[PDB]
Amino acid sequence: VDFPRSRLRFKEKLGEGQFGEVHLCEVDSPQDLVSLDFPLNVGHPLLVAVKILRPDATKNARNDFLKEVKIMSRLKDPNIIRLLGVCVQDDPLCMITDYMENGDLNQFLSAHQLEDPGDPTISYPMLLHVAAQIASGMRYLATLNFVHRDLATRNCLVGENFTIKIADFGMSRNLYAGDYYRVQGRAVLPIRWMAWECILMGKFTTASDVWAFGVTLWEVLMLCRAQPFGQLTDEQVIENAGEFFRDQGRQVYLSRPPACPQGLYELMLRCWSRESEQRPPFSQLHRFLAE
Ligand SMILES: O=C(Cc1cccc(C#Cc2cccnc2)c1)Nc1cccc(C(F)(F)F)c1
């Protein structure tokens, strides 16, 4: 049974995508809608984000939208985006999720400086808290044997009090076009976040998600101040994968961020182990970061 679409009132656009755009909507007097799937605290109207399939969508776009509903219906964790409701029995097709009022994590961290017109700062423990939450969400996806394939701060959302949820906004956003390697007729690839075996073999696993987490953790500790391997070309990043394969000590790594102690950097390096099996599981990464 659908969420009652009439209870949504459009406020503004937040973003757009390959098979739907995301609108900020208001829900008046939401108390009668509360359920195991639809939580509420309560500025008395509830704000939600709604991804909507517009009227001129291609058949291919509609199919991808309906499959995204199915994929997201799997997701049941405090640090993963969740479907509060859907409207799919008639058009327009809608996915309803929590409004994450501080937007994507990359833009959020880019707007802060590490604790030494106001001046937004973030503390080192809070950075660790951000990182721990990402690891907790990934720990959950690992239990589902669900491979994310595009973990990065651009795909994470920030709510109140530095709460984090992992999401997936796809690979077509102009804002982050430089984070993907495009060859005509091939899958688009986030190569600067990809494990060497992914670059060479095009297959993604939980272990390559762990590598991408290492790069995401590096982003967080950089406060997103620069692109991974930013002074290298896409081609050099791809060649670096070859050097991991050959294992003659000529592969290169992301450097230690200014805000990152050597002990935490050693954890990053463990995420970038040549051998998939030597990379720490997310349960271990989460324990380290939280404790
Ligand atoms: O995350 C999405 C896309 C999507 C769908 C519906 C709503 C929103 C939003 C939003 C928003 C934006 C700003 C502020 N507040 C909220 C985003 N898909 C998806 C597909 C497969 C796997 C995953 C997973 F595993 F990463 F969680 C996620």
Side-chain angles (χ1 to χ4, degrees):
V1 188
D2 281 343
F3 181 95
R5 194 190 286 99
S6 65
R7 292 289 293 276
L8 301 174
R9 177 175 58 253
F10 169 82
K11 292 312 283 176
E12 52 176 305
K13 294 178 57 181
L14 301 173
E16 299 176 57
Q18 323 104 276
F19 40 101
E21 42 193 69
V22 181
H23 299 185
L24 181 59
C25 289
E26 270 183 347
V27 180
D28 296 326
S29 188
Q31 285 75 26
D32 58 311
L33 296 171
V34 172
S35 70
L36 283 186
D37 297 314
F38 198 85
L40 181 71
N41 188 75
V42 152
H44 209 267
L46 172 70
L47 296 178
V48 291
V50 185
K51 183 166 169 174
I52 311 180
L53 191 69
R54 296 318 288 276
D56 62 354
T58 63
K59 289 180 183 177
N60 290 353
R62 180 176 188 96
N63 179 65
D64 285 346
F65 189 104
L66 287 175
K67 283 203 298 197
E68 185 164 44
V69 169
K70 292 187 175 294
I71 292 166
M72 296 184 78
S73 300
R74 296 181 62 179
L75 312 176
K76 305 291 188 179
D77 186 88
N79 293 112
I80 306 294
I81 185 168
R82 69 181 168 201
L83 283 180
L84 299 173
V86 298
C87 309
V88 298
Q89 300 297 308
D90 52 12
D91 277 24
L93 306 181
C94 299
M95 285 180 264
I96 304 164
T97 189
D98 303 86
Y99 174 51
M100 300 292 284
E101 69 181 28
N102 283 294
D104 93 41
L105 175 61
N106 188 293
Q107 306 181 44
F108 180 81
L109 289 178
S110 290
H112 292 67
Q113 290 182 320
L114 184 73
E115 280 189 359
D116 187 345
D119 280 324
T121 51
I122 182 162
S123 71
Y124 176 71
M126 204 57 72
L127 288 175
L128 287 183
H129 179 52
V130 166
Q133 288 177 87
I134 297 173
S136 184
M138 291 305 298
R139 183 190 58 192
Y140 168 83
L141 295 181
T143 74
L144 302 183
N145 299 305
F146 182 96
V147 180
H148 185 287
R149 306 162 311 179
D150 196 16
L151 180 66
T153 63
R154 62 180 176 274
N155 276 328
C156 297
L157 295 169
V158 189
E160 306 190 19
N161 301 132
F162 299 92
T163 54
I164 305 294
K165 295 184 185 188
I166 302 166
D168 185 351
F169 289 100
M171 309 191 274
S172 293
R173 295 187 292 178
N174 301 332
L175 183 56
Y176 297 112
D179 291 347
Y180 298 94
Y181 175 66
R182 295 178 174 84
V183 173
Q184 191 188 118
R186 299 188 190 165
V188 174
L189 300 176
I191 52 170
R192 293 158 191 275
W193 283 258
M194 287 169 58
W196 69 270
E197 75 273 4
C198 300
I199 291 178
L200 293 190
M201 269 85 61
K203 185 183 184 298
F204 298 86
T205 65
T206 295
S208 61
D209 277 348
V210 167
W211 179 296
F213 175 84
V215 183
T216 303
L217 177 62
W218 180 91
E219 294 186 271
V220 171
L221 272 294
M222 291 286 295
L223 288 84
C224 294
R225 283 318 197 267
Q227 189 190 49
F229 299 113
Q231 300 303 85
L232 301 180
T233 67
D234 285 346
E235 291 69 27
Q236 290 175 305
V237 167
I238 288 167
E239 181 52 36
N240 194 44
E243 291 296 345
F244 275 94
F245 173 66
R246 291 185 287 273
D247 196 23
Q248 304 186 49
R250 297 190 205 100
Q251 62 274 18
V252 300
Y253 299 89
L254 298 170
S255 302
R256 190 175 80 191
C260 183
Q262 178 64 23
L264 187 59
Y265 184 58
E266 298 284 348
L267 174 154
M268 292 176 191
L269 291 171
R270 290 194 284 282
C271 297
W272 305 324
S273 298
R274 179 185 191 279
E275 308 313 312
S276 281
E277 339 83 56
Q278 286 176 28
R279 303 180 193 151
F282 283 113
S283 57
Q284 185 178 316
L285 293 163
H286 171 253
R287 201 183 314 112
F288 186 108
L289 289 165
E291 304 186 356

